[PDB]
Amino acid sequence: GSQLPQNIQFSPSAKLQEVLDYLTNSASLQMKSPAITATLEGKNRTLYLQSVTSIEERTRPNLSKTLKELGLVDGQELAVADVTTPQTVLFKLHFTS
Q: At 4, is the secondary structure helix, strand, or coil?
């Protein structure tokens, strides 16, 4: 694959779930969606899998939150692993405002 990050632009109010639709396919990829993992402050944070602790319940809190609320910033690198692709792809997340 490519070891250089691919660049994508998002609005800070966009959810991690929206990223999934945007990434490859929107409708056909709804449960098929790749998993994005990011390193945040030297610790590895999984953004697709529920590595986020949530109050009460929240079935999918990580997906429900925005990229901004997830602690993502412009220039942040994301490592995505996909089911349709046997490769890990690196992305740079760029926020538009």
A: coil
- CA–CA separation, 20 and 32 (whole Å): 9
Instruction: Name residue, tokens 């990050």.
Output: 5
Q: Domains (ranges, CATH) in the chain?
A: 1-97 (3.10.290.20)
Determination technique used: NMR
Fill in the amino acid letter for 58.
R
Please give the DSSP secondary-structure letter assigned to residue 15: B
Sheet with 88-95, edge to edge strand ranges: 6-10, 88-95, 76-81, 35-40, 43-46
How buried is 72 (Cβ within 10 angstroms: 0-12 exposed, 13-18 middle, 19+ buried)?
buried
Of the candidates 81, 45, 47, the one whose C-alpha atom is nearest the C-alpha of residue 64 is 47
Residues 6+ apart with CB under 8 A from 30: 20, 21
Could you tell me if 28 and 78 are in contact, meaning their C-beta atoms sit under 8 angstroms apart? no
| C-alpha–C-alpha distance, residues 15 and 25, integer Å | 16
